[PDB]
Amino acid sequence: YDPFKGSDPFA
Amino acid sequence: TLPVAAAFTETVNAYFKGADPSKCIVKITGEMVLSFPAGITRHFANNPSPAALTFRVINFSRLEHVLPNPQLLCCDANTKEFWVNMPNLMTHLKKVSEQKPQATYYNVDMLKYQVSAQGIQSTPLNLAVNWRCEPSSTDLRIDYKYNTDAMTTAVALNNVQFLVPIDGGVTKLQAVLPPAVWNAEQQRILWKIPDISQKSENGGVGSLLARFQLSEGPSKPSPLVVQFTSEGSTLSGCDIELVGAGYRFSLIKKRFAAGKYLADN
Ligand SMILES: [Zn+2]
Ligand SMILES: [Zn+2]
Ligand SMILES: [Zn+2]
Ligand SMILES: [Zn+2]
CATH class of the missing domain: 2.60.40.1170 (Mu homology domain, subdomain B)
Known part of the structure; x- marks a missing residue:
C-alpha cells in the first residue's frame, strides 16, 4: 500500500 | 538540503446498532510513513555521517498504543520528539535502492498507532x-x-x-x-x-x-457494509514538523478510510 501513489512527492 | 515526505493514514472502524448511539463501537488505527527521493543513494555517498534527522509529532496526546519502528526509533504530554537512527535508515535505503533501482521514492514505516475515539462522535x-x-x-x-x-x-x-x-x-x-x-x-x-x-x-x-x-x-x-476514503485530513489532528537543519518537507499527506464499517438493525 502506497500513500502517495500515484502522484509524486518531489515535483 | 534533502527533500523528504510524510504521510498519515488512519483507518476508522465503526459498528452501529439500530438507532442507539450508545451502542456504537469505534476503533481508529493509523500509520505514519516517511518517504525519501531516489537521489538519497548518491546523497548518502557524499555525506555519511549525515545531518541528524529529527522530527516532532504534534497532538500526540490524542494517540494511544503507539509502536515506533524498532530498527529506526525509541531507544512530554502533547508533543513527542524523535531522533531517527541514521545508520539503519541508510542500510535500509541502500538495500531497497539496489533492489528497486528504478524507483522514484522509498516509503519507510515510521509509526503505528491507535487513536482514542469517543463513540459516535468520532465517526x-x-x-x-x-x-x-x-x-x-x-x-x-x-x-x-x-x-x-x-x-x-x-x-x-x-x-x-x-x-x-x-x-x-x-x-x-x-x-x-x-x-x-x-x-x-x-x-x-x-x-x-x-x-x-x-x-x-x-x-x-x-x-x-x-x-x-x-x-x-x-x-x-x-x-450493512460501508466503504469510503478521504484525502486532506486526519481523524487524530496529528501533524509533523522537522526539527534541526538538513531536511525539508516537500509534502505531508493526510488521509483516512473506512476499514470494517458496519451497521446492524
Ligand atoms: Zn544532496
Ligand atoms: Zn517531549
Ligand atoms: Zn530495512
Ligand atoms: Zn505500511
Whole structure:
C-alpha cells in the first residue's frame, strides 16, 4: 500500500 | 538540503446498532510513513555521517498504543520528539535502492498507532439502519449523516459504497431511492455515492430506501457494509514538523478510510 501513489512527492 | 515526505493514514472502524448511539463501537488505527527521493543513494555517498534527522509529532496526546519502528526509533504530554537512527535508515535505503533501482521514492514505516475515539462522535459517517420484515416483503431504510466533528478539518468522503445482503429469495425491487444496483448471483444491493460533504445535498444528511418482494421470506437482517476514503485530513489532528537543519518537507499527506464499517438493525 502506497500513500502517495500515484502522484509524486518531489515535483 | 534533502527533500523528504510524510504521510498519515488512519483507518476508522465503526459498528452501529439500530438507532442507539450508545451502542456504537469505534476503533481508529493509523500509520505514519516517511518517504525519501531516489537521489538519497548518491546523497548518502557524499555525506555519511549525515545531518541528524529529527522530527516532532504534534497532538500526540490524542494517540494511544503507539509502536515506533524498532530498527529506526525509541531507544512530554502533547508533543513527542524523535531522533531517527541514521545508520539503519541508510542500510535500509541502500538495500531497497539496489533492489528497486528504478524507483522514484522509498516509503519507510515510521509509526503505528491507535487513536482514542469517543463513540459516535468520532465517526465521520453516522449510520442508522431499520428493517421491516413482513412474511412476504421487506422494507429497508438507511439513514446517514456526514459528521464534521470527527475530522480535523471538514473534507469530503469519496467513493462511498453501501452494500447489504438481502435474504429470503428476492424477486422484485420496488420503491428504490436513490438508484442502486441489484446483484442477483450474490443476492445483495449496492448503492454508490461519489461525494459526501457539506457541499452535498442536505449537508451530507440523507436516506437510502428499498423495498423487496420475497419468494420465500421472511428475511433475516444482515449487516450493512460501508466503504469510503478521504484525502486532506486526519481523524487524530496529528501533524509533523522537522526539527534541526538538513531536511525539508516537500509534502505531508493526510488521509483516512473506512476499514470494517458496519451497521446492524
Ligand atoms: Zn544532496
Ligand atoms: Zn517531549
Ligand atoms: Zn530495512
Ligand atoms: Zn505500511
